[PDB]
Write a protein that binds this ligand. Structure first.
Ligand SMILES: Nc1nc2c(ncn2[C@@H]2O[C@H](COP(=O)(O)OP(=O)(O)O)[C@@H](O)[C@H]2O)c(=O)[nH]1
Ligand SMILES: [Mg+2]
Lengths: 322, 170
């Protein structure tokens, strides 16, 4: 209710869905849609719907054959439908039939229709922990882990006509980020942003922007911090980044030996960082990683994640932007 | 023969994992390598009269597994369980790290090699008999290594490859 306030929303009871991490969160209308993840014993493919108005958790109604249970997958929005791509599929408990994926599924919110987009032609390498977003009527996927090495390629796919569309690989130019996985992606202005992420030997707290119009990567020279500005957030992986009113909000993740819960704000125009100050009456969320985030109206929603030890979480938190 | 082998170096922080994997590959000891940096290493070497392709993951981090580690832990053909002979706590955690690997792959016969690193240090705290007794109970070899002097570094790693071959025979 207050500006810059963490409210603790009613968690998803195990009666509706198991506490999970490595899932996806999607905002559509006034509801949050949670898909997939890991409950600690097995991979999931159920679809959850949290209504922001009545704060009611709910096992969403579906019809078609859903995607195979998976985690470390992507989910994006395009019109009246959700799009799930990639992930990790198999049986955790028996450690068998494990493989990365490159399939593409559609979920029409209107009818609850699961429909696999069986795309012909050459496909991107099956991958997990990649980043994904929508821009100019196309689904953009970037980097990830394929089972052999971390990736840094980029592919697009038109989301208008299933029959006419096919995968294209983007010819990226500029200072491409090193091979990354388990990072968040956010689009602001006409640029796509990537902050930190598990890049193994080359892991740092560098902020990269990708100009969509000329396919050019750029490392943000935020070393200006030495000239008064606050330092960027500590390097991390498995964190969530959302954009709201030309500002990047980074939360959570696992940073070396810590699980910080400072809410970091990147002023994209001023090119400066900041740690947002929560309100005096805020219910602060505990440090977590492999959660997922979404924005409805002028608020950020945090659901799930692993919260210290290995306790998976079904908690839902809402940070009220200005 | 050309065969690939996925190895995973596990153990408590600061036992030698990084400096020990670096030694096998570049033949040089590294005093300070970032304690929370986890990436893979690769080496082509002949073992038991066969050209082996080594895919080794120096592990780090304490929270949930990065997607690369998550898959290395599930696809890993053999595991080095490393502890420091000058640090009791690293030896006590070995029993946890073993149960971890057993539950991840759902098997009791997983190739493993118990490694007591830092044997060059004159400040030994974990008796050789203790780790020998533990490894015999687990049914796995135990090799003491020193990444500083490279003693046993090649043996410990090549022994793990031999244990993967033996388990593939049965
Ligand atoms: N004396 C001695 N010190 C070692 C040896 N191996 C590693 N170290 C030291 O132990 C510390 C941690 O080693 P490191 O490989 O980075 O630890 P880890 O990667 O977390 O397993 C470093 O300061 C190393 O210099 C060894 O064989 N002998
Ligand atoms: Mg290390």
């Amino acid at each position: 209710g207050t500006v810059h306030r963490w409210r603790r929303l009613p968690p998803c009871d195990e009666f509706v869905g198991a506490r999970r991490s490595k899932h996806t969160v999607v905002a559509y209308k006034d509801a949050i849609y949670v898909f997939g993840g890991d409950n600690g014993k097995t991979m999931l493919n159920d679809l959850l719907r949290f209504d922001v108005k009545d704060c009611s958790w709910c096992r969403a109604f579906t019809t078609g054959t859903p995607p195979a249970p998976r985690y470390h997958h992507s989910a994006v929005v395009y019109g009246s439908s959700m799009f799930v791509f990639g992930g990790y599929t198999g049986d955790i408990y028996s450690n068998s039939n494990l493989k990365n994926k490159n399939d593409l599924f559609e979920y029409k919110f209107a009818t609850g229709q699961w429909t696999e987009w069986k795309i012909e032609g050459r496909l991107p390498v099956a991958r997990s922990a990649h980043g994904a977003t929508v821009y100019s009527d196309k689904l953009w996927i970037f980097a990830g882990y394929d089972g052999n090495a971390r990736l840094n390629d980029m592919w697009t796919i038109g989301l208008q006509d299933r029959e006419l569309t096919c995968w294209e690989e983007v010819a990226q130019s500029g200072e491409i980020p090193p091979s990354c996985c388990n990072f968040p992606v956010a689009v602001c202005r006409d640029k796509m942003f990537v902050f930190s992420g598990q890049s193994g030997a080359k892991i740092t707290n560098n902020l990269f922007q990708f100009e969509f119009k000329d396919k050019t990567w750029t490392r943000i020279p935020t070393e200006h911090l030495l000239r008064g500005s606050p330092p960027p957030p500590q390097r991390r992986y498995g964190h969530t980044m959302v954009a709201f009113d030309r500002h990047l909000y980074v939360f959570g993740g696992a940073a070396d030996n810590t699980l910080p819960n400072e809410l970091h704000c990147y002023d994209v125009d001023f090119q400066t960082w900041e740690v947002v100050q929560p309100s005096s009456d805020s219910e602060l969320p505990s440090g977590r990683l492999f959660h997922a985030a979404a924005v409805i109206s002028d608020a950020m929603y945090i659901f799930g994640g692993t919260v210290d030890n290995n306790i998976r979480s079904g908690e839902m938190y809402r940070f009220q932007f200005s | 023969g050309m065969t690939e082998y996925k190895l995973v170096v596990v153990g408590a922080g600061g036992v030698g994992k990084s400096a020990l994997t670096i030694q096998l590959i570049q033949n040089h000891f590294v005093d300070e390598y970032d304690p929370a940096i986890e990436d893979s290493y690769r080496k082509q070497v002949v073992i038991d009269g066969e050209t082996c392709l080594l895919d080794i993951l120096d592990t780090a981090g304490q929270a949930e597994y990065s997607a690369m580690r998550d898959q290395y832990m599930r696809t890993g053909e053999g595991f080095l369980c490393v502890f420091a002979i000058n640090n009791t706590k690293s030896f006590e955690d070995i029993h946890h790290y073993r149960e971890q690997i057993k539950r991840v792959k759902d098997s009791e016969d997983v190739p493993m090699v118990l490694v007591g690193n830092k044997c060059d240090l004159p400040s030994r705290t974990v008796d050789t008999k203790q780790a020998q007794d533990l490894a015999r109970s687990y049914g796995i070899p135990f090799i003491e290594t020193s990444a500083k002097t490279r003693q046993g570094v090649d043996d410990a790693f090549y022994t793990l490859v031999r244990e993967i071959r033996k388990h593939k025979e049965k």
